[PDB]
Amino acid sequence: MRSKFKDEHPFEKRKAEAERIRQKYTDRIPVICEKVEKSDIATIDKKKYLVPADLTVGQFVYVIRKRIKLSPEKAIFIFVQDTLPPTAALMSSIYELHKDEDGFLYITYSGE
Structure with missing residues (x-):
């Protein structure tokens, strides 16, 4: 459940x-x-994102799909603090609830 962005960079910075x-x-x-450690899915090329607040969760899943070029038949699940957020929710609503103390919103994506 550890994050590599969290471990590599100090909290203050x-x-x-x-x-x-x-x-x-x-x-x-x-x-x-970031990718969950043990999933068969590929690893995202770009770790950090500027995401519009009006974007829904499901819309962001789609960007993840097209950044890894995930085959359209494949499945993919997004985890915010080890929960599955509703796709119909605004990322602004996810951010205010689940933002990290450092100010970032941390997602892990898997395949099961």
């Missing part, structure tokens, strides 16, 4: 960056998207 990003893009959600 992470926190400072998130505040820096929140100030510059007040309409966007800073997102860290």
Whole structure:
């Protein structure tokens, strides 16, 4: 359940960056998207995202699908603090509830 972005970078710098990003893009959600350790899915090329707050969770799944070029028949599940968020929910609603103390919103994506 550990995050590599969390372990590689100190909390203070992470926190400072998130505040820096929140100030510059007040309409966007800073997102860290990582793969769950033991899933067969591929690994995302780009870890960190500026996500529009009006985007739904399901819309963000779609961006994850097309960033890994996941075959359309394949399945993919997104986890926010080891929960499956509803696709119809706004990422702004997910962010206010599940933002990390550093200010980032941490997702893990799997395949089962």
